[PDB]
Symmetry: C2
Subunit: 310 residues, 2 copies
């Protein structure tokens, strides 16, 4: 119920789906179908709570007018375009280069927060947003004697340009979602229901397109849907659903910058946990990135009188 508990919980669970994905990714299923099931989980859990809210509550705010309902399409259109850009990018860059260009969403959300959401940021705060992006990048940077030597700056221009466009779309999606939640006095569960309906539709249309690409002659998406699905596979479907509901909560009762701080701190926690479990070699880059990020946290969230005291 407090934004900082939800944000902390999102951090805990964003790193859970991180580890559970790799474990489940032990050589058996389709990660094309999970986002569909993950959306279906969110759509049906939101609908449940909407139903329960209508039967429990004297008044439930719900804008049924197509003027406002149709606007929940946009995020899905952005995310569709985003997925094409992501796929396009990876045909110029190795996934590590792509993973590290991903920290640009922190600055692009920053900018669109100001531009689209028209919200005010101090200079100290702007410097924190940048520090966060720099701090996360720092932890990811390829250390000495790393077998996949990514020759820096030596990737094709298309790669760099698309990586940048990817981050702008990623940010735009999140920032537009916040707009939708906060533009209405409506119920969180009704906003979710509309949002995640269009997501289900578009996820589904994607899989139908994929089947169209092979002339519908091969196996259809609905038949294949459950193939290889272990328990761990189902854990991440729920886990991806869970975190997605928290993101919506924060889109309503918080902001994108709290989101990207949660997401960023999850990525650091994952690396810290990977040392004890997957036994990954701890590096100075991890150490440094954490300190930058902890300080980036304080800068942005610390009350401005605490910044100035002894």
């Amino acid at each position: 119920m407090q934004w900082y508990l939800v944000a902390a919980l999102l951090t805990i669970l964003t790193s859970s789906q991180g580890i559970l994905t790799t474990l489940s990714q032990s050589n058996n299923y389709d990660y094309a179908t999970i986002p569909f099931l993950a959306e279906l989980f969110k759509l049906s859990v939101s609908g449940f709570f909407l139903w329960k809210e209508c039967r429990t509550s004297p008044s439930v705010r719900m804008t049924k007018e197509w003027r406002s309902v149709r606007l929940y399409v946009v995020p899905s259109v952005i995310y569709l375009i985003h997925n094409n850009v992501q796929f396009a990018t990876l045909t110029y860059v190795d996934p590590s280069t792509y993973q590290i260009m991903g920290n640009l969403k922190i600055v692009t959300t920053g900018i669109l927060f100001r531009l689209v959401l028209k919200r005010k940021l101090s200079n100290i705060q702007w410097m924190a947003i940048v520090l966060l992006a720099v701090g996360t990048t720092t932890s990811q940077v390829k250390g000495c004697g790393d077998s996949p030597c990514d020759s820096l700056f030596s990737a094709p221009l298309e790669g760099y340009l698309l990586g940048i466009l990817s981050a702008c779309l990623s940010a735009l999606a999140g920032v537009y979602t916040e707009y939708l939640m906060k533009k209405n006095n409506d119920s969180l569960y009704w906003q979710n229901v509309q949002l995640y309906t269009f997501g289900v539709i578009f996820n589904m249309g994607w899989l139908i397109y994929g089947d169209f690409k092979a002339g519908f002659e091969l196996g259809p998406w609905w038949q294949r849907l459950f193939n290889g699905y272990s328990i761990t596979t189902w854990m991440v479907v729920f886990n991806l659903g869970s975190t997605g509901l928290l993101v919506s909560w924060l889109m309503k009762y918080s902001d994108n910058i709290v989101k990207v701080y949660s997401t960023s701190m999850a990525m650091l926690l994952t690396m810290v946990l990977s040392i004890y479990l997957f036994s990954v070699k701890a590096t100075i880059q991890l150490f440094l990135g954490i300190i930058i990020c902890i300080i980036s946290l304080q800068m942005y969230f610390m009350p401005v009188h605490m910044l100035i005291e002894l």
Copy 2:
């Protein structure tokens, strides 16, 4: 130089590329490795051919298009095979697909008799089957395995294509043996022709893939080295190595020695995965090994040793 040392070495190295693949499958494209692996074999064969011509008084080499053009066929089969493999996986989970893979043992068996016209005793036929049964046994999904593959409950297309896949797989191998043994030619010249067409077709595949997206995205040659770790290069060499041994066996041995090596590699991988990846040893592993060890004895044991005390 002795077939049984090469076969044993192929077993050792077929399981090496097995582990090294998963370890490296930790950043790259497994679409491009077969291309580099073929290039390695083509250029290592060419090297030894060159060296053989400069070292040897006489080198047997049939340059006539009548016989050179026949080295295309394996590549055409393997191309069709890869389409079938991809098609299959859109009806079945990879485990179901992996376990249907033991049918290549019986399909090589049959085509050995049909295409290569070679003679098998009944004891030998029973060994070929036992091998396929023994490998399947080790793979079978044990109690409390999270991906519960509802047996027999897959689509018909899946089962039918899995079967067709095995026939093509076998046909490719059996036809290769035909090519090696139909000539008195140099191993290195047979490799050079074989692996030239393989390079060409591997390359045409990647060009097709780029055509499928209108050549608008990243081209295969630019992308070729992306994500390539040292580990990645180890399996490229390792996949090249084993492939040269397969050719040796296509010439101076037979497909059945191949599939015994491949099968025993798959068992060794599971045994090694217990100490390294710490996979839980099962009775199915234990049973499959005993079946396979006995399947080995049956096929290779001299028939007087089978009958003594």
